[PDB]
Amino acid sequence: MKTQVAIIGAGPSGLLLGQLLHKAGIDNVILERQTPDYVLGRIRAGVLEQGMVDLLREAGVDRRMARDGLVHEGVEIAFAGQRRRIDLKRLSGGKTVTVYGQTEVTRDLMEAREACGATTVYQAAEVRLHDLQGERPYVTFERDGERLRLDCDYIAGCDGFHGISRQSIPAERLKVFERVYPFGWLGLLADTPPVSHELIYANHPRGFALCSQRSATRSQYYVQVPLSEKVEDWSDERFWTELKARLPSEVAEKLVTGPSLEKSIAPLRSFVVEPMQHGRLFLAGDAAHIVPPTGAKGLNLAASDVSTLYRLLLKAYREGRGELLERYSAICLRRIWKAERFSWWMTSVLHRFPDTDAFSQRIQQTELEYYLGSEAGLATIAENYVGLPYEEIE
Amino acid sequence: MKTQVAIIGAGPSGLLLGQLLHKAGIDNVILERQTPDYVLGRIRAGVLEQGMVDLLREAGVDRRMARDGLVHEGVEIAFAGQRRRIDLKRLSGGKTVTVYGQTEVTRDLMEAREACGATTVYQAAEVRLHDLQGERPYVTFERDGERLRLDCDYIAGCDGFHGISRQSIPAERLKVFERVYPFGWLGLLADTPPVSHELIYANHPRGFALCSQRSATRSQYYVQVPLSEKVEDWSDERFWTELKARLPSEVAEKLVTGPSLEKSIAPLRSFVVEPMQHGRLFLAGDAAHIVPPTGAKGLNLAASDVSTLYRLLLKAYREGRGELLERYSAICLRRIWKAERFSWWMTSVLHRFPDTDAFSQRIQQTELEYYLGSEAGLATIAENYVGLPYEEIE
Ligand SMILES: Cc1cc2nc3c(=O)[nH]c(=O)nc-3n(C[C@H](O)[C@H](O)[C@H](O)COP(=O)(O)OP(=O)(O)OC[C@H]3O[C@@H](n4cnc5c(N)ncnc54)[C@H](O)[C@@H]3O)c2cc1C
Ligand SMILES: Cc1cc2nc3c(=O)[nH]c(=O)nc-3n(C[C@H](O)[C@H](O)[C@H](O)COP(=O)(O)OP(=O)(O)OC[C@H]3O[C@@H](n4cnc5c(N)ncnc54)[C@H](O)[C@@H]3O)c2cc1C
Ligand SMILES: NC(=O)C1=CN([C@@H]2O[C@H](COP(=O)(O)OP(=O)(O)OC[C@H]3O[C@@H](n4cnc5c(N)ncnc54)[C@H](OP(=O)(O)O)[C@@H]3O)[C@@H](O)[C@H]2O)C=CC1
Ligand SMILES: NC(=O)C1=CN([C@@H]2O[C@H](COP(=O)(O)OP(=O)(O)OC[C@H]3O[C@@H](n4cnc5c(N)ncnc54)[C@H](OP(=O)(O)O)[C@@H]3O)[C@@H](O)[C@H]2O)C=CC1
């Protein structure tokens, strides 16, 4: 097989890059290890930044999101029994966030690709990358029982945190930055209506809790739990009971509990690799970084990497400016680190850390008190929650 | 589940460590991602060092190897039309090498374990490691559809180069050393008798070639090829024809060619991570290092790591000397680097490298000429080929 851009990964990153490239006229092939059903079988809500939403429009895959998505003009933080609203819309000009699951976004993208006939190979096992230093890079993989090879100009590794593209760059050439938090997020999806029309992040002595929603018809809730907790020791009622205890009574009082459609425990962590490229290979999304969910930034960073990479790819092909791709890492990395910072900040002011002393407890309470009570402070959060502006290339 | 030593990997490393531990009386559990058939389905010959052979005896799994293995007292190197024999037996005291496939060794080990009833979980998917810093480490994995947890004292990562145990140590705490050679080994297994009763390593202007044997009834041959070569462009006769061209006519003349039972291209590479442990996790075999096959050292290093780790584990449990495990890495690493050196040396004097000048060509020819023509020289190779002695712990 021969193509211009090889794309490892049919997740939101791969699909989005692939579609954008498709419409620009740049030939591309996506290699996915799993099956269409498997990929689409992973459930996950999503809070999308305006940038992410604009990028999907441009990709021509915004039809359904426009009909089913929920545009939130604000977000809430609760602590010390009170609820404080951060007017995202006003405090940032007019940017907003749109609630539309990742599963749905992925689904929407697979339909757009399946339709236009762009190339996608599923069940592409044992993917391996070659000649990243030369100018004739290629990929090998086994499908339906035979050995295949795919030649290209550049490979975009969008295979996520456990992918192989990052694992294909000489370790020495990369610097890894990471933090593993001492807790995870126990989540419960339900078809019960949301306790609020905007998300609610709650700080509480017993621990962090989150009131969100995957769609208009399903609620998404989270409570922080030690890393050694087993999801099977958390029956629905035990969850619902802990959730209420971490919320202001006014909220826990009007909350509609129900049987959990899905439950699980997701560990929190920060991960950043520098640089995010090697020769003809460029990393995007989870393949290059991980951010704790507290900032609602995983899918969104993935989108900005894609945007930057797409846009630089145009320049390169559509203008023979193949050098501008050297600036890929430095550009994304600047937005990635700012995203890591805001998510690290959100995590620190919202969660209960172990062995924390009286002073730390007071500083945390004061962080929330000052930021939520100041216009400058409320603005730092707003502009970050909606997502910082994408940096122009040239 | 609860056990003393958790073992990730049911390959030669895992199985060997597991059996040895079993006989010592230390409780152990092996978690394997694949199925028994799959593991056993990977075919691979093997040249075992005396140390490896002694370790299998001690493990009580030497019955079949003793009946089917071939003990070679010497090995040959060909170059410039001549054949030079390195009397391994004499030049090293009495140590020898035994030819018995890895597949067979693995098979022999699975039967010994299956029989004694020791614990082994196959199809243990999504393995993940936890609490490596504390003293109550544990492992999580999904089987038959449910989520399981395994507690232990120490985890031994024997999951190979693509395993997850190495990928579970904070990247920053590890230093990686590696070299990727500009060529691979195209191999052809046949049921035709071997052209020689001892292996034949051949240096030749056209490139390296190897005459070996998996068993008494099957031949194993290899020719070096550029990394971009596709196995499908190498029909049996094209292989046989190239093989003969790299051998002294006296050998190629009495060679019995036949249809290839198995063919493939294996890339060569050197890989070493320092240290080879993190808290309660210890790496063994391919999970910590890779050596080019030219030295016949992959399986053998794996065995010496296992020996060292087993022996230190005894001390720890059987004597409360749990500190001696801190010396695991430094001990193995000293033998690993010497093995990397000998394999790197063998590779350099036997293969054709690209863009090599007249001087390099002459030095290589002279390396072979001097070492094979000197008793001191023949000894450096002999003592290394059979395998250097295992370093005592205390
Ligand atoms: C509780 C929680 C909530 C989250 N909520 C949000 C949210 O509200 N908003 C937000 O912005 N982010 C959110 N995220 C993050 C988001 O889920 C990820 O950042 C996103 O999935 C990354 O997409 P990706 O395409 O980069 O990788 P993935 O979605 O992981 O996709 C990678 C794809 O490539 C495949 N692949 C892997 N290995 C290979 C291989 N060897 N060969 C070929 N293909 C391979 C994979 O199987 C997969 O299909 C959340 C995370 C958590 C833990
Ligand atoms: C051409 C060639 C010839 C060779 N010939 C020889 C020779 O003659 N002599 C010699 O000494 N060496 C030889 N070797 C090397 C030898 O094959 C390896 O070094 C050996 O297989 C390593 O064994 P291991 O148990 O460490 O790993 P492996 O055999 O790779 O086993 C690891 C096991 O763990 C499993 N695992 C992986 N991931 C997970 C996970 N996530 N969870 C659970 N389990 C997991 C794997 O599926 C596998 O079963 C050769 C190599 C090459 C390329
Ligand atoms: N995902 C991850 O965690 C990591 C990915 N990588 C990257 O992946 C590649 C790893 O290199 P590598 O695994 O060697 O390449 P491959 O995975 O492609 O090698 C597989 C080929 O090696 C053969 N082989 C391996 N062992 C033996 C043996 N004992 N006897 C005979 N044949 C054997 C295979 O046989 P068969 O098919 O029979 O098994 C097969 O022909 C590199 O690209 C590296 O940069 C590196 C580290 C980690
Ligand atoms: N092999 C390798 O290459 C590597 C291994 N590692 C190591 O592996 C672990 C990696 O950490 P991590 O992957 O997070 O742990 P896990 O692989 O165990 O995390 C899986 C859990 O995270 C959930 N999850 C992930 N994304 C989402 C999402 N968007 N929405 C809802 N739930 C989600 C999973 O859901 P579901 O089941 O639905 O997917 C599931 O509950 C660490 O031990 C690390 O040190 C690190 C790097 C590489």
JSON list of N, CA and C in Angstrom, two decimals, chain A residues 33 38 126 128 130-131 138 147 149 162 164 167 169-172 176-178 227-232, chain B residues 33 38 126 128 130-131 138 147 149 162 164 167 169-172 176-178 227-232:
[
{"chain": "A", "resi": 33, "resn": "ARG", "atom": "N", "xyz": [-5.78, -1.09, 15.41]},
{"chain": "A", "resi": 33, "resn": "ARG", "atom": "CA", "xyz": [-5.57, -2.43, 15.94]},
{"chain": "A", "resi": 33, "resn": "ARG", "atom": "C", "xyz": [-6.87, -3.17, 16.23]},
{"chain": "A", "resi": 38, "resn": "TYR", "atom": "N", "xyz": [-15.36, -2.68, 18.64]},
{"chain": "A", "resi": 38, "resn": "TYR", "atom": "CA", "xyz": [-14.57, -2.54, 19.85]},
{"chain": "A", "resi": 38, "resn": "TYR", "atom": "C", "xyz": [-14.31, -1.07, 20.15]},
{"chain": "A", "resi": 126, "resn": "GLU", "atom": "N", "xyz": [-0.04, -6.33, 15.08]},
{"chain": "A", "resi": 126, "resn": "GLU", "atom": "CA", "xyz": [1.42, -6.21, 15.11]},
{"chain": "A", "resi": 126, "resn": "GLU", "atom": "C", "xyz": [1.97, -5.06, 14.30]},
{"chain": "A", "resi": 128, "resn": "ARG", "atom": "N", "xyz": [4.14, -2.06, 13.19]},
{"chain": "A", "resi": 128, "resn": "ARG", "atom": "CA", "xyz": [5.54, -1.73, 13.45]},
{"chain": "A", "resi": 128, "resn": "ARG", "atom": "C", "xyz": [5.92, -0.60, 12.51]},
{"chain": "A", "resi": 130, "resn": "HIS", "atom": "N", "xyz": [8.86, 1.87, 10.53]},
{"chain": "A", "resi": 130, "resn": "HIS", "atom": "CA", "xyz": [10.20, 1.76, 9.93]},
{"chain": "A", "resi": 130, "resn": "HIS", "atom": "C", "xyz": [10.67, 3.02, 9.23]},
{"chain": "A", "resi": 131, "resn": "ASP", "atom": "N", "xyz": [11.99, 3.15, 9.10]},
{"chain": "A", "resi": 131, "resn": "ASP", "atom": "CA", "xyz": [12.62, 4.27, 8.41]},
{"chain": "A", "resi": 131, "resn": "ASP", "atom": "C", "xyz": [12.12, 5.66, 8.76]},
{"chain": "A", "resi": 138, "resn": "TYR", "atom": "N", "xyz": [7.81, 3.82, 6.23]},
{"chain": "A", "resi": 138, "resn": "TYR", "atom": "CA", "xyz": [6.75, 2.86, 5.93]},
{"chain": "A", "resi": 138, "resn": "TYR", "atom": "C", "xyz": [6.31, 2.09, 7.17]},
{"chain": "A", "resi": 147, "resn": "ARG", "atom": "N", "xyz": [0.90, -10.57, 5.50]},
{"chain": "A", "resi": 147, "resn": "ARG", "atom": "CA", "xyz": [1.79, -9.48, 5.88]},
{"chain": "A", "resi": 147, "resn": "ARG", "atom": "C", "xyz": [1.66, -8.32, 4.90]},
{"chain": "A", "resi": 149, "resn": "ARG", "atom": "N", "xyz": [2.46, -4.00, 3.89]},
{"chain": "A", "resi": 149, "resn": "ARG", "atom": "CA", "xyz": [3.34, -2.86, 4.05]},
{"chain": "A", "resi": 149, "resn": "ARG", "atom": "C", "xyz": [2.67, -1.61, 3.48]},
{"chain": "A", "resi": 162, "resn": "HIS", "atom": "N", "xyz": [-1.22, 3.67, 25.30]},
{"chain": "A", "resi": 162, "resn": "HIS", "atom": "CA", "xyz": [-0.63, 2.35, 25.19]},
{"chain": "A", "resi": 162, "resn": "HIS", "atom": "C", "xyz": [-0.21, 1.98, 23.78]},
{"chain": "A", "resi": 164, "resn": "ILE", "atom": "N", "xyz": [1.92, 2.12, 20.03]},
{"chain": "A", "resi": 164, "resn": "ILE", "atom": "CA", "xyz": [3.28, 1.71, 19.74]},
{"chain": "A", "resi": 164, "resn": "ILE", "atom": "C", "xyz": [4.12, 2.81, 19.12]},
{"chain": "A", "resi": 167, "resn": "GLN", "atom": "N", "xyz": [6.28, 4.27, 21.57]},
{"chain": "A", "resi": 167, "resn": "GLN", "atom": "CA", "xyz": [7.25, 3.23, 21.88]},
{"chain": "A", "resi": 167, "resn": "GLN", "atom": "C", "xyz": [8.19, 2.93, 20.71]},
{"chain": "A", "resi": 169, "resn": "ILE", "atom": "N", "xyz": [10.08, 5.54, 19.22]},
{"chain": "A", "resi": 169, "resn": "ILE", "atom": "CA", "xyz": [11.08, 6.60, 19.20]},
{"chain": "A", "resi": 169, "resn": "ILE", "atom": "C", "xyz": [12.20, 6.19, 20.17]},
{"chain": "A", "resi": 170, "resn": "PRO", "atom": "N", "xyz": [13.47, 6.28, 19.74]},
{"chain": "A", "resi": 170, "resn": "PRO", "atom": "CA", "xyz": [14.57, 5.90, 20.63]},
{"chain": "A", "resi": 170, "resn": "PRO", "atom": "C", "xyz": [14.40, 6.58, 21.98]},
{"chain": "A", "resi": 171, "resn": "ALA", "atom": "N", "xyz": [14.16, 5.79, 23.01]},
{"chain": "A", "resi": 171, "resn": "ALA", "atom": "CA", "xyz": [13.95, 6.31, 24.36]},
{"chain": "A", "resi": 171, "resn": "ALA", "atom": "C", "xyz": [14.85, 7.48, 24.76]},
{"chain": "A", "resi": 172, "resn": "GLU", "atom": "N", "xyz": [16.14, 7.39, 24.44]},
{"chain": "A", "resi": 172, "resn": "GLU", "atom": "CA", "xyz": [17.10, 8.43, 24.78]},
{"chain": "A", "resi": 172, "resn": "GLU", "atom": "C", "xyz": [16.76, 9.81, 24.21]},
{"chain": "A", "resi": 176, "resn": "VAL", "atom": "N", "xyz": [10.70, 12.31, 29.55]},
{"chain": "A", "resi": 176, "resn": "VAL", "atom": "CA", "xyz": [9.37, 12.05, 30.06]},
{"chain": "A", "resi": 176, "resn": "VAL", "atom": "C", "xyz": [9.10, 12.82, 31.35]},
{"chain": "A", "resi": 177, "resn": "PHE", "atom": "N", "xyz": [7.91, 13.42, 31.42]},
{"chain": "A", "resi": 177, "resn": "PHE", "atom": "CA", "xyz": [7.51, 14.18, 32.60]},
{"chain": "A", "resi": 177, "resn": "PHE", "atom": "C", "xyz": [6.20, 13.57, 33.05]},
{"chain": "A", "resi": 178, "resn": "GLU", "atom": "N", "xyz": [6.12, 13.18, 34.32]},
{"chain": "A", "resi": 178, "resn": "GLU", "atom": "CA", "xyz": [4.87, 12.60, 34.82]},
{"chain": "A", "resi": 178, "resn": "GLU", "atom": "C", "xyz": [4.67, 12.66, 36.32]},
{"chain": "A", "resi": 227, "resn": "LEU", "atom": "N", "xyz": [-6.43, 4.55, 45.32]},
{"chain": "A", "resi": 227, "resn": "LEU", "atom": "CA", "xyz": [-6.08, 3.70, 44.19]},
{"chain": "A", "resi": 227, "resn": "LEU", "atom": "C", "xyz": [-6.28, 2.21, 44.42]},
{"chain": "A", "resi": 228, "resn": "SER", "atom": "N", "xyz": [-6.31, 1.79, 45.68]},
{"chain": "A", "resi": 228, "resn": "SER", "atom": "CA", "xyz": [-6.48, 0.38, 46.00]},
{"chain": "A", "resi": 228, "resn": "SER", "atom": "C", "xyz": [-7.94, -0.08, 46.12]},
{"chain": "A", "resi": 229, "resn": "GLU", "atom": "N", "xyz": [-8.89, 0.82, 45.82]},
{"chain": "A", "resi": 229, "resn": "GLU", "atom": "CA", "xyz": [-10.30, 0.47, 45.92]},
{"chain": "A", "resi": 229, "resn": "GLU", "atom": "C", "xyz": [-10.72, -0.39, 44.74]},
{"chain": "A", "resi": 230, "resn": "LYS", "atom": "N", "xyz": [-11.56, -1.38, 45.03]},
{"chain": "A", "resi": 230, "resn": "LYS", "atom": "CA", "xyz": [-12.07, -2.30, 44.01]},
{"chain": "A", "resi": 230, "resn": "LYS", "atom": "C", "xyz": [-13.49, -1.90, 43.65]},
{"chain": "A", "resi": 231, "resn": "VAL", "atom": "N", "xyz": [-13.72, -1.63, 42.37]},
{"chain": "A", "resi": 231, "resn": "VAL", "atom": "CA", "xyz": [-15.03, -1.22, 41.91]},
{"chain": "A", "resi": 231, "resn": "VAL", "atom": "C", "xyz": [-16.15, -2.15, 42.40]},
{"chain": "A", "resi": 232, "resn": "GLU", "atom": "N", "xyz": [-15.84, -3.43, 42.57]},
{"chain": "A", "resi": 232, "resn": "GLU", "atom": "CA", "xyz": [-16.84, -4.38, 43.01]},
{"chain": "A", "resi": 232, "resn": "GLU", "atom": "C", "xyz": [-17.27, -4.22, 44.46]},
{"chain": "B", "resi": 33, "resn": "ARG", "atom": "N", "xyz": [-0.41, -13.57, 29.29]},
{"chain": "B", "resi": 33, "resn": "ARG", "atom": "CA", "xyz": [-1.40, -12.91, 28.45]},
{"chain": "B", "resi": 33, "resn": "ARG", "atom": "C", "xyz": [-2.00, -13.84, 27.39]},
{"chain": "B", "resi": 38, "resn": "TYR", "atom": "N", "xyz": [-0.83, -20.77, 22.03]},
{"chain": "B", "resi": 38, "resn": "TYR", "atom": "CA", "xyz": [-0.18, -19.64, 21.40]},
{"chain": "B", "resi": 38, "resn": "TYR", "atom": "C", "xyz": [1.30, -19.58, 21.80]},
{"chain": "B", "resi": 126, "resn": "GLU", "atom": "N", "xyz": [-5.11, -7.42, 30.04]},
{"chain": "B", "resi": 126, "resn": "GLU", "atom": "CA", "xyz": [-4.94, -6.11, 30.66]},
{"chain": "B", "resi": 126, "resn": "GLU", "atom": "C", "xyz": [-4.21, -6.13, 31.99]},
{"chain": "B", "resi": 128, "resn": "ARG", "atom": "N", "xyz": [-1.88, -5.18, 34.92]},
{"chain": "B", "resi": 128, "resn": "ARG", "atom": "CA", "xyz": [-1.43, -3.88, 35.40]},
{"chain": "B", "resi": 128, "resn": "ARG", "atom": "C", "xyz": [-0.78, -4.10, 36.76]},
{"chain": "B", "resi": 130, "resn": "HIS", "atom": "N", "xyz": [0.74, -2.66, 40.54]},
{"chain": "B", "resi": 130, "resn": "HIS", "atom": "CA", "xyz": [0.44, -1.64, 41.55]},
{"chain": "B", "resi": 130, "resn": "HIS", "atom": "C", "xyz": [1.31, -1.72, 42.79]},
{"chain": "B", "resi": 131, "resn": "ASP", "atom": "N", "xyz": [1.41, -0.60, 43.50]},
{"chain": "B", "resi": 131, "resn": "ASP", "atom": "CA", "xyz": [2.17, -0.50, 44.75]},
{"chain": "B", "resi": 131, "resn": "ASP", "atom": "C", "xyz": [3.56, -1.11, 44.76]},
{"chain": "B", "resi": 138, "resn": "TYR", "atom": "N", "xyz": [0.69, -5.58, 44.39]},
{"chain": "B", "resi": 138, "resn": "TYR", "atom": "CA", "xyz": [-0.34, -6.46, 43.85]},
{"chain": "B", "resi": 138, "resn": "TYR", "atom": "C", "xyz": [-0.54, -6.25, 42.35]},
{"chain": "B", "resi": 147, "resn": "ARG", "atom": "N", "xyz": [-12.92, -9.22, 36.85]},
{"chain": "B", "resi": 147, "resn": "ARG", "atom": "CA", "xyz": [-11.74, -8.49, 37.30]},
{"chain": "B", "resi": 147, "resn": "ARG", "atom": "C", "xyz": [-11.11, -9.20, 38.49]},
{"chain": "B", "resi": 149, "resn": "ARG", "atom": "N", "xyz": [-7.58, -9.72, 41.25]},
{"chain": "B", "resi": 149, "resn": "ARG", "atom": "CA", "xyz": [-6.44, -9.09, 41.90]},
{"chain": "B", "resi": 149, "resn": "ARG", "atom": "C", "xyz": [-5.56, -10.15, 42.55]},
{"chain": "B", "resi": 162, "resn": "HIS", "atom": "N", "xyz": [8.19, -6.77, 24.71]},
{"chain": "B", "resi": 162, "resn": "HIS", "atom": "CA", "xyz": [6.96, -6.01, 24.56]},
{"chain": "B", "resi": 162, "resn": "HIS", "atom": "C", "xyz": [6.06, -6.06, 25.77]},
{"chain": "B", "resi": 164, "resn": "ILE", "atom": "N", "xyz": [4.69, -5.53, 29.83]},
{"chain": "B", "resi": 164, "resn": "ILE", "atom": "CA", "xyz": [4.24, -4.32, 30.49]},
{"chain": "B", "resi": 164, "resn": "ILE", "atom": "C", "xyz": [5.02, -4.01, 31.76]},
{"chain": "B", "resi": 167, "resn": "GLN", "atom": "N", "xyz": [7.44, -1.44, 31.16]},
{"chain": "B", "resi": 167, "resn": "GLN", "atom": "CA", "xyz": [6.65, -0.24, 30.92]},
{"chain": "B", "resi": 167, "resn": "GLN", "atom": "C", "xyz": [5.93, 0.25, 32.17]},
{"chain": "B", "resi": 169, "resn": "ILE", "atom": "N", "xyz": [7.74, 0.89, 35.16]},
{"chain": "B", "resi": 169, "resn": "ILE", "atom": "CA", "xyz": [8.73, 1.58, 35.98]},
{"chain": "B", "resi": 169, "resn": "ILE", "atom": "C", "xyz": [8.80, 3.03, 35.49]},
{"chain": "B", "resi": 170, "resn": "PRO", "atom": "N", "xyz": [8.75, 4.00, 36.41]},
{"chain": "B", "resi": 170, "resn": "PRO", "atom": "CA", "xyz": [8.81, 5.41, 35.99]},
{"chain": "B", "resi": 170, "resn": "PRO", "atom": "C", "xyz": [9.98, 5.61, 35.05]},
{"chain": "B", "resi": 171, "resn": "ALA", "atom": "N", "xyz": [9.69, 5.93, 33.79]},
{"chain": "B", "resi": 171, "resn": "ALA", "atom": "CA", "xyz": [10.71, 6.13, 32.77]},
{"chain": "B", "resi": 171, "resn": "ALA", "atom": "C", "xyz": [11.98, 6.86, 33.25]},
{"chain": "B", "resi": 172, "resn": "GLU", "atom": "N", "xyz": [11.80, 7.94, 34.02]},
{"chain": "B", "resi": 172, "resn": "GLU", "atom": "CA", "xyz": [12.93, 8.72, 34.52]},
{"chain": "B", "resi": 172, "resn": "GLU", "atom": "C", "xyz": [13.92, 7.92, 35.35]},
{"chain": "B", "resi": 176, "resn": "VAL", "atom": "N", "xyz": [18.21, 3.87, 29.30]},
{"chain": "B", "resi": 176, "resn": "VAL", "atom": "CA", "xyz": [18.15, 2.90, 28.22]},
{"chain": "B", "resi": 176, "resn": "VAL", "atom": "C", "xyz": [19.38, 2.96, 27.33]},
{"chain": "B", "resi": 177, "resn": "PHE", "atom": "N", "xyz": [19.91, 1.80, 26.99]},
{"chain": "B", "resi": 177, "resn": "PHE", "atom": "CA", "xyz": [21.07, 1.71, 26.12]},
{"chain": "B", "resi": 177, "resn": "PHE", "atom": "C", "xyz": [20.67, 0.81, 24.98]},
{"chain": "B", "resi": 178, "resn": "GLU", "atom": "N", "xyz": [20.83, 1.27, 23.74]},
{"chain": "B", "resi": 178, "resn": "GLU", "atom": "CA", "xyz": [20.47, 0.45, 22.60]},
{"chain": "B", "resi": 178, "resn": "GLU", "atom": "C", "xyz": [21.15, 0.80, 21.29]},
{"chain": "B", "resi": 227, "resn": "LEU", "atom": "N", "xyz": [17.16, -4.35, 6.20]},
{"chain": "B", "resi": 227, "resn": "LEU", "atom": "CA", "xyz": [15.92, -4.27, 6.97]},
{"chain": "B", "resi": 227, "resn": "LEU", "atom": "C", "xyz": [14.66, -4.07, 6.16]},
{"chain": "B", "resi": 228, "resn": "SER", "atom": "N", "xyz": [14.80, -3.55, 4.94]},
{"chain": "B", "resi": 228, "resn": "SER", "atom": "CA", "xyz": [13.65, -3.31, 4.09]},
{"chain": "B", "resi": 228, "resn": "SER", "atom": "C", "xyz": [13.24, -4.50, 3.21]},
{"chain": "B", "resi": 229, "resn": "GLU", "atom": "N", "xyz": [13.89, -5.64, 3.39]},
{"chain": "B", "resi": 229, "resn": "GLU", "atom": "CA", "xyz": [13.57, -6.82, 2.59]},
{"chain": "B", "resi": 229, "resn": "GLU", "atom": "C", "xyz": [12.28, -7.46, 3.08]},
{"chain": "B", "resi": 230, "resn": "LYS", "atom": "N", "xyz": [11.47, -7.92, 2.13]},
{"chain": "B", "resi": 230, "resn": "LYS", "atom": "CA", "xyz": [10.20, -8.57, 2.43]},
{"chain": "B", "resi": 230, "resn": "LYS", "atom": "C", "xyz": [10.36, -10.08, 2.29]},
{"chain": "B", "resi": 231, "resn": "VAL", "atom": "N", "xyz": [10.06, -10.80, 3.36]},
{"chain": "B", "resi": 231, "resn": "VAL", "atom": "CA", "xyz": [10.20, -12.25, 3.34]},
{"chain": "B", "resi": 231, "resn": "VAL", "atom": "C", "xyz": [9.52, -12.90, 2.13]},
{"chain": "B", "resi": 232, "resn": "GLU", "atom": "N", "xyz": [8.45, -12.29, 1.64]},
{"chain": "B", "resi": 232, "resn": "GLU", "atom": "CA", "xyz": [7.72, -12.85, 0.51]},
{"chain": "B", "resi": 232, "resn": "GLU", "atom": "C", "xyz": [8.46, -12.74, -0.82]}
]
